[PDB]
Specification:
4 copies of one chain form a homotetramer.
Chain A (H helix, E strand, L loop, with lengths): L4 H9 L6 E6 L2 H10 L4 E3 L1 H9 L9 H12 L7 E4 L7 H14 L3 E4 L12 H17 L5 E6 L2 H4 L1 H13 L4 E4 L5 H10 L6 E3 L11 H7 L3 E4 L4 H18 L10 H7 L2 H10 L6
Bound molecules: magnesium ion (4 copies).
Chain lengths: 288, 284, 284, 284
C-alpha cells in the first residue's frame, strides 16, 4: 500500500518535542536545492507559484489546477518529506474545498492552509462562511480516510485586530482544523500571547523577513512554543537577486561567465540524474 | 487584428545584419528578470523546463502539454519580444509535429527547434525520418498561415562527426527550415567552418559553458557569422548557486538573513504588479 | 493567421445573418454536429462540467478546464465559429482579462460572461461589478487586437425582474459588449419585447427545451429578430438517453448487441482519419 | 489510511471465483451512466479518450497528461469501483513508464494496460517491451502501490499466434499481473491462449463486429478469462443518437427532444443530490 507524508507530519504534530522547519520553495529546482541542504519539510508558497507558473504577482491568478499540479510535483520529489502547500481560500464554496482536499491528498501533500479572505477582490469573509470552508475540508479528508493536515489561517489581524483573530482561530479549531496560522503577527509579545491563547493547539509562524513580524529564528520560534516555522522567501529572494546580477553581467560581458562547476551535468545531478539513471538501469537496458 | 512576434523575428533573420542574443529562461521569474535586464529575445530551455516544471534532468520527461504551456506563458509576458522555444523532436510523428507547430503558433511562440534524435544517449533517427519532421512543421505552419520560424537542429556530431552534421542540415535547409543549429560544436575552427559550409542560411550557436563547446562570447559569435546565440543556463546556474547558498545558511542560522530589499513587494513589482494594477483600475 | 472570431464578427454586423449553434461538449459531439452540416457551434459549460468532470453545472470548472475544451472544439474546424461559455470570467478584471486573451489565442469565436457570483456557498453581483467584468473583456481584447465577440449575459430575470435585466443588458452594451443574452425568457411577447428594448444590438436566444422558455425554432427566432440561437442540450440529451439504454441492456444480456455499423472504423471516420492521413502522407 | 480500488481488484483477481465485467467509458457522463446501470468495474477507453478529449482518431495523439487526467476523474466518480485504464505504450522509456505508474497509482486507477507498439500496427522488439513491463512493476513496488499491471500484445495480426504467446510469457515473467491478447479471432484461439498461459489472469477485449466473435460475459467467464471489457458500449450508442438528433435539428430547426431531456435530469445523472449533501454538511 501507498503511504503519505501526511501521516508522518500528523504523527510529529501529536508529539510535543517535534518542531517543523520548512523553507519556502516554488518549483522543482528550489525543491531539489532545499532537499539537498537537508531540510525535513518544505513549504510550497503560492506567491512563488504565481511568480514561477504565470510570471505574476500573487493576486489570486492560480486556479486549483495550477496549484495542485505544483504541490503534487513538489511532494513527489522526496515522498517521505512533508510538504505544506498554500491552498488560498479553497477555490470556491464547500464543494470546491472538498475537491481541493481530495486532490491534494491523492497528490501526497502533507498539509495545506485555508484562509478567511474573499476568493476574488485584504478583504475578509464573515466567520460563518470561513468555518464553512474549514468544516468542508475536515469532512472531505474524513470521507476519503486522509490524514492530510488542515491548517486554519486568518488574515484578520490588521483588519479586525487581535481578539477577533483569536476568535476566528478558535472557531476553526472547534470545526476540526489541526493547526492555527495567525498571519502577520506584529511583535514577539503578540507571538507569545497567541501561543498562550490557543494553548495546546499547534501553531505555525510565518517568517517572511522585513514585514509586520520581527525576525524570529527557528530555535526561538520553537522555544516560544510554535510547532511549525515556514519561510516562504528562503529561495525566491536569493534567486531573483542572483538572476538579476547574472543577467546584467551577461549584458555587459556577452557570456554568462558561470563557475567551472556549473556544468549541465551538475544541474542534472541537482535534479536527481543518478537516481533516474538507476531507475532506467534497473528496468533492464539501456539508455545510459 | 491579432499579432505574433514570429513575424518580427522572421524579418530580423531576413536582414543579413541582425544578430540575436537570447538568454536562457525557464519559468515566469527568470523570464521577467531577463526582460527587465533589457534583452530583446528570450530562449526557453527545455532542460530548464524539466528542472522547474518537474524537478528532473533533461531526459525527455516533458510532454507537449508541459512545454507548450511554459512557452505560451513566457511568450505572453512581453508579447512583442520574440521567444525561441525548445520543441524537442516535435512530440511524435508528422501528425504530432503539426499539433506542436499549431499549438506553438496560437500561443505566440516566435521560433522553435526540432532535432533528429529518437523521441524516446545520444541516439539518432535517419535523415528521411528527420526531414519528415521538418516538412510536417513547415507544411503545418503554411496551412494556418503562421510565420513561426522553424529551427532545424542536429545532434549527430558526437556520434557521426562533422560532414554528417552538415549534410543533415543541408537536407533540412532544403525541406524549408529557416535556421540551422549544429549542437555541441567542439572548437572555434568548426564554428567558423559550419558557417561557411552553410553560407546564406542563418545559424544558431547554443552557448552552454563548460560542456563540449569552448566559451565563445556574443561578440566572437557575431564575428564568426552566427545569426543567433542562446545561453540556456544563463538564469539557471545563478539561481541554483544562490538558492543553495541561502538554504545552507538558513540551515546553519535558523533564519534566512535576507537582504533588507528581498521583500514580497520587491517580487511583486519584478512580476509586473504596477501593470496588473492598471488593468484592474482601467476596468473599474 | 486567421480565426473565426473575425468572420462571426462580420456575420453579426451584416443584418441578414442568423447563427444557429447546437450545443456541443467534447470533440465527438463537435465532429457529429459538423458532419450534420452546422455552420456554428456552442460549447455548453453544463456539458463541459458533466463530461470533463462528471459533475452537475455547479461552477466546478476552472479557466484551465473551459479553455482547453474551447480550444480543442474551436480547432476541429478552425473556420467554423465556436461560441463558448466563459461563466463569470473566473475572477476579477485580472482573470476576466486572461480568459479573453487565452480564448482569443485559442481560436474561440465568441464567449459569454454573466452577472452571477463566481462562487456560491441564483445569487448575483451588483451592476458595477458586472459591468467591470464586461469592461475588462472589451479592453483586454482591444489591447491584443482580438476580434473575439463579447456576449453579455444576465441571470437577473428571476431574481430582480425584467426591467432590471434590461438595465444590466443596456449597461453591458454601453461598456462595449457585442451581443446580449437574457437568460430564461418566459414567453414570445417577452422575446419580441427584448429584441425591441435593445433594438440594433444583436441578441442570443438560449433554447433549452422544456424549461422557462416556450419552444422557438431557429426560423421563428430569426423572424422575431434574434441573431443567434443556441441549443445547449442538442447533443447531451440524446447521448445520455441512448447510453443509459445501452448500458442497461448490456447489464441484462452480457454483451452490448450494437448495430453492425457501431464500429471503431466508423468512429475514426467521424473523427477525421482521412484528413489525418492526408497530413501524414504530405510530410513524406 | 486512504485506500484505493487497486487493492480490492488485485485481491479479487487472486480469488478464482471472481470475474470482472467492465464497460467502456470515455468521459464523466458515460461513466455516471454505466455506474447507475449497476456495473462494478469500469474500463477507460483510449480511442474514446482521443475522440472526446481531442476530437480525433486513436492515432497516438493523447499524452500522459491527457490520459492520466481523464483516468483520475473517472476513478474518482465512485472511488470504491475499480477502473481499468488504457496506458498506450506508457509514454516513453523506463523513466516515463514509471511516471505513468506513479501518477496512475496516486489517481486511484485500479489497473492499466501497456502494449508493444512503437510510441510513434508497428511493434517494438520483445526486449524493449519487457523493459516497460519491468519498469511499471518496479515503479509501483517502490511506492507500495497495488495497481494491476496488464500486459497487452498487438502482435497477433502482424506476427501470428505463437509470437503473441511468446510476448505475453515474457511480460508475465517480468512481473505483469494480467495478459491481454488483442484481437482474438476465434473461440478456439480464446481457449488455447487461456490454456497456454494457465494460472495467469487473462482479459478479453470484446468489441463486436471485428475479428473477435460475440462472446458474452457469461461465456468469457466459463472459458477461463478473468476480465471482460466492452470498449464501445457507450461510444456506439452516443454517436448514433447524436447523429440522428443533429440531422433532425438540421431539418426541423428545433431539437424536439423528449420531455425527460432536461438540465435537472443531467444534474441528477451527474450526482446533484450528493453534491448538495456535501454542501449542507459543510454549513453545517
Ligand atoms: Mg495564497
Ligand atoms: Mg530538449
Ligand atoms: Mg455555465
Ligand atoms: Mg491506445
Amino acid at each position: 500500500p501507498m503511504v503519505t507524508a501526511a501521516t508522518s507530519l500528523r504523527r510529529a504534530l501529536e508529539n510535543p518535542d517535534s518542531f517543523i522547519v520548512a523553507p519556502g520553495v516554488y518549483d522543482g529546482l528550489s525543491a531539489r536545492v532545499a532537499l539537498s541542504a537537508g531540510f525535513d519539510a518544505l513549504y510550497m508558497t503560492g506567491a512563488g507559484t504565481a511568480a514561477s507558473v504565470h510570471g505574476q504577482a500573487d493576486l489570486g491568478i492560480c486556479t486549483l489546477n495550477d496549484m495542485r499540479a505544483n504541490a503534487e510535483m513538489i511532494s513527489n520529489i522526496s515522498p517521505s518529506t512533508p510538504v505544506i502547500a498554500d491552498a488560498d481560500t479553497g477555490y470556491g464554496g464547500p464543494i470546491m474545498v472538498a475537491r481541493t482536499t481530495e486532490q491534494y491528498s491523492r497528490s501526497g501533500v502533507a498539509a495545506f492552509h485555508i484562509e478567511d479572505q474573499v476568493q476574488t477582490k485584504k478583504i475578509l469573509v464573515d466567520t460563518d462562511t470561513y468555518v464553512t470552508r474549514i468544516r468542508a475540508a475536515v469532512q472531505a479528508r474524513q470521507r476519503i480516510g486522509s490524514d492530510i493536515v488542515v491548517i486554519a489561517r486568518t488574515d484578520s489581524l490588521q483588519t479586525h485586530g487581535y481578539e477577533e483573530s483569536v476568535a476566528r482561530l478558535r472557531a476553526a479549531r472547534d470545526a476540526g482544523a489541526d493547526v492555527g496560522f495567525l498571519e502577520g503577527i506584529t511583535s514577539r509579545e503578540m507571538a507569545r500571547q497567541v501561543i498562550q491563547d490557543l494553548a495546546g493547539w499547534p501553531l505555525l509562524l510565518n517568517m517572511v523577513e522585513h514585514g509586520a513580524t520581527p525576525s524570529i529564528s527557528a530555535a526561538e520560534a520553537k522555544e516560544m512554543g510554535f510547532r511549525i516555522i515556514i519561510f516562504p522567501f528562503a529561495a525566491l529572494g536569493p534567486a531573483v537577486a542572483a538572476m538579476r546580477e547574472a543577467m546584467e553581467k551577461l549584458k555587459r560581458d556577452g557570456i554568462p561567465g558561470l563557475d567551472k562547476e556549473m556544468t549541465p551535468q551538475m544541474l542534472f545531478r541537482v535534479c536527481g540524474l543518478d537516481e533516474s539513471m538507476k531507475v532506467d538501469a534497473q528496468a533492464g537496458g539501456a539508455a545510459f
